């Protein structure tokens, strides 16, 4: 049946989803997720979008401000809007699945509402493709692939140049923060290949 989604959990509660098309497959995924981790996912949504102060108060305002200053939601929505129907079905189905359970939770809260919601004083709302996308974007991209300390680095080099002079300071910066170290143990052995690009390490952009 094209409309049928089967959910089978093993003896560790791990869900396996069986469905024919994409929207149904990820609808089933979001369903079981909303069953297992609703509160965690709600708080992750708020973390990745900077809406934590809404429910936890003043101490998270700085946090919320920082999250929003670190990305551009319109750009994310634009990428979602460009997705093929097939790729969109992933996010939409996933979002619809959660909502199917969230609706059931908010209809019979006295038995289905995760305790934490009562404790933290609020209830879950529905998700859209954007929310699902931002879970990934805020927890893998904006936090796990968004690293740089260039402003400090320039400050260190500047302090090293003042202390040891221009040439010596540049050379010591190359000693504390080298661009490459050929003795670095590598996942790929040298016999396999090496990296062809060599970058400038004299700060010639000044």
């Amino acid at each position: 049946s094209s409309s049928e989604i089967k959910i089978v959990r093993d003896e560790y509660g791990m869900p396996h989803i069986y469905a024919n098309d994409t929207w149904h497959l990820f609808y089933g995924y979001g369903y079981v997720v909303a069953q297992d981790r609703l509160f965690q996912m709600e708080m992750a949504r708020r973390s990745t979008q900077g809406t934590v102060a809404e429910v936890l108060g003043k101490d998270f305002v700085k946090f919320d401000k920082d999250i929003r200053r670190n990305y551009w939601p319109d750009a994310i929505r634009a990428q979602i809007a460009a997705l093929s129907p097939e790729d969109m079905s992933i996010l939409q189905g996933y979002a619809d699945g959660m909502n199917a359970w969230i609706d059931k939770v908010n209809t019979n809260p006295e038995t289905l509402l995760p305790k934490q919601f009562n404790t933290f004083g609020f209830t879950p709302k529905r998700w859209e493709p954007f929310d699902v996308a931002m879970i990934f974007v805020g927890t893998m991209a904006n936090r796990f692939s968004d690293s740089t300390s260039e402003i400090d680095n320039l400050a260190l080099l500047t302090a090293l140049k003042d202390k040891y002079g221009v040439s010596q300071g540049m050379a010591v910066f190359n000693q504390l923060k080298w661009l490459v170290n050929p003795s670095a143990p590598t996942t790929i052995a040298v016999q396999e290949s090496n990296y062809p690009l060599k970058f400038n390490q004299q700060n010639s952009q000044t």
Binding site: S3, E4, H16, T148, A155, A184, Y195, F199, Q205
Partner: protein, 557 residues
């Protein structure tokens, strides 16, 4: 995060073995989510962070996959030129270009709402400003505009059935992530995936560049450039956040280096120790690396050289001999609080003293503080993440390597002093510090072990559970937040693939309104502690035979 993939040439009783240990910190409920998908072109099983549509750790019965952070430099800072007149604009390519901006209002529980403005240029969102020289810094990510493509690449890669189809998806993953491959035929592979900028000639990726236009990236480097290997001569693929490839540059983070001293060597020596490994032995590498002090191997030779000429009764020589007998593998005493050996405490105190005497002394304040951590610092709750060789320690290592180090020592960290003298003085501090605390009988030193805590706040520091849901594990283990292993063509099984993972505390974070915890709320927590694991099912037969519950939904879009 660590990962080792054992290929056909080194697998025993199997063709390929993949053991992944992603390190995200520890959390309750579990950081990752177990999930099996069967339909719409998918047939997979495994677990994944925050239940992303795409499983970061799993397999489809034909290939398996995994990840660890790439730590390439995919982020540069552009210094935008501003003007007191025409606020909100910045000079780019000879013209004053209008910045992008948006209003944001932070609603606040039991507080006042706050609205502010976020700014963006062609280079990225604005960090800090500075209306003295009128400069604002824009953070430029090579993956900008590719967030969703990376999310979809992580999903579609699950459908691959060989190296070619898989690398096709790896090419679309724009974040800086190491991807790993293994399959039923014994093949294995690695790709340092990610979008990387094609920088102008002379652009030092460690320092900011002008945003006036002349330093704009030429574009992005092609997939050809991404470090990759398929069926390496070595017969294995091991990573623990170390360099992908010879001459490949690391992240610009001052606190992050790939150098001669790298924790990944701990995995290498265990995989190279034996010609072939079985599934259980490859798994056992988790336990071993979990307990392995990462500094003993790096500095013991220097410690030995410096104390080789001291007499029996010299205390400092006694401390080095203590370390010499030690295999660096920490184990708990029956008290479940202390370590059987004082090795790490000795190294910790010594190393801290060395850094203070060497790297820290040579660096102008307050930057000097950047190189003072020994890498053992922790709280009563234990490390928030993995243990690693500290940046200061890595610099020190190059210094004690002498000429065997390829890094020019522009300045002598030892300030003209004999290296032995400084090493000895630090051992003197170590003995004074430790003996005064534990007594002069080293053999009964019961030094505190690190503990581990599954935290109720997620990595952001935001509650994802109530405070009481936090779980404690006596023994800190420098291992993945979760561990999964896929074994292809196991010779003792009827199936062409076997897989295991551990998702602690458990699959479920649900607590009913009356406080009744779900049956799978904590049924993997002890298993995690004991280095145990549970089977991941893929086929309809295995899933059915192991079903506890079932449900069928009928829905149309």
């Amino acid at each position: 995060s660590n990962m080792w993939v054992i290929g056909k040439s080194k697998a025993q009783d199997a063709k390929a073995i993949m053991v992944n240990g992603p390190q995200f910190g520890w959390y309750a409920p579990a950081y990752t989510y177990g999930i099996g998908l069967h339909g719409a072109g998918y047939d997979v099983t495994g677990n994944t962070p925050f239940a992303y549509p795409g499983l970061v750790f799993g397999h489809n019965g034909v290939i398996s996959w995994g990840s660890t952070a790439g730590f390439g430099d995919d982020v540069d800072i552009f210094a935008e030129r501003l003007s007191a007149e025409k606020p909100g604009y910045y000079l780019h390519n000879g013209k004053w270009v209008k910045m992008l901006s948006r209003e944001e209002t932070i609603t606040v529980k039991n507080g006042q709402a706050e609205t502010f403005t976020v700014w963006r240029t062609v280079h990225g969102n604005i960090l800090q400003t500075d209306q003295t020289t009128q400069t604002a810094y824009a953070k430029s990510r090579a993956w900008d505009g590719k967030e969703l493509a990376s999310l979809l690449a992580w999903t579609h890669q699950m459908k691959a059935k060989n190296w070619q189809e898989w690398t096709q998806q790896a090419a679309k993953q724009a974040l800086t992530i190491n991807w790993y491959y293994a399959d039923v035929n014994g093949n294995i592979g690695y790709v340092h995936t990610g979008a990387y900028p094609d920088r102008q000639s002379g652009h030092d990726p460690r320092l900011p560049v002008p945003g006036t236009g002349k330093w704009d990236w030429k574009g992005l480097l092609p997939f050809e450039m991404n470090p990759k290997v398929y069926n390496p001569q070595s017969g294995y693929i091991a990573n623990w956040a170390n360099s992908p490839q010879k001459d490949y540059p690391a992240s610009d983070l001052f606190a992050f280096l790939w150098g001669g001293a790298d924790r990944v060597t701990e995995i290498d020596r265990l995989l190279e120790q034996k010609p072939r490994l079985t599934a259980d032995q490859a798994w056992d590498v988790i336990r071993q690396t979990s307990r392995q002090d990462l500094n003993l191997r790096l500095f013991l030779p220097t410690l030995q050289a410096a104390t080789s000429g001291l007499t029996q009764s010299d205390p400092r020589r006694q401390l080095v001999e203590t370390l010499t007998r030690w295999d660096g593998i920490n184990l708990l005493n029956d008290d479940g609080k202390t370590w059987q050996q004082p090795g790490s405490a000795i190294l910790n105190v010594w190393l801290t003293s060395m850094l203070k005497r060497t790297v820290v002394a040579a660096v102008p304040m307050p930057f000097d503080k950047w190189y003072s951590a020994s890498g053992y610092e922790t709280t009563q709750d234990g490390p928030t993440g993995s243990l690693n060789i500290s940046v200061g320690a890595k610099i020190l290592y190059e210094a004690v390597q002498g000429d065997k180090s390829p890094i020019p020592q522009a300045v002598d960290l030892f300030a003209g002093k004999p290296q032995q003298e400084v090493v000895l003085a630090a051992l003197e501090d170590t003995w004074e510090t430790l003996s005064k605390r534990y007594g002069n009988n080293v053999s009964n030193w019961k030094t505190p072990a690190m503990a581990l805590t599954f935290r109720a706040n997620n990595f952001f520091g935001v509650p994802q559970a109530a405070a009481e849901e936090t779980r404690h594990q006596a023994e800190y283990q420098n291992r993945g937040t979760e561990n999964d292993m896929i074994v292809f063509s196991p010779t003792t099984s009827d199936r062409p693939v076997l897989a295991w993972d551990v998702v602690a505390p458990g699959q479920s974070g649900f607590i009913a309104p009356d406080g009744t915890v779900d049956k799978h709320y904590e049924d993997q927590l002890k298993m995690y502690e004991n280095f145990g694991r549970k089977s991941l099912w893929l086929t309809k037969q295995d899933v059915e035979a192991h079903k506890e519950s079932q449900e069928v939904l009928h829905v149309q879009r």
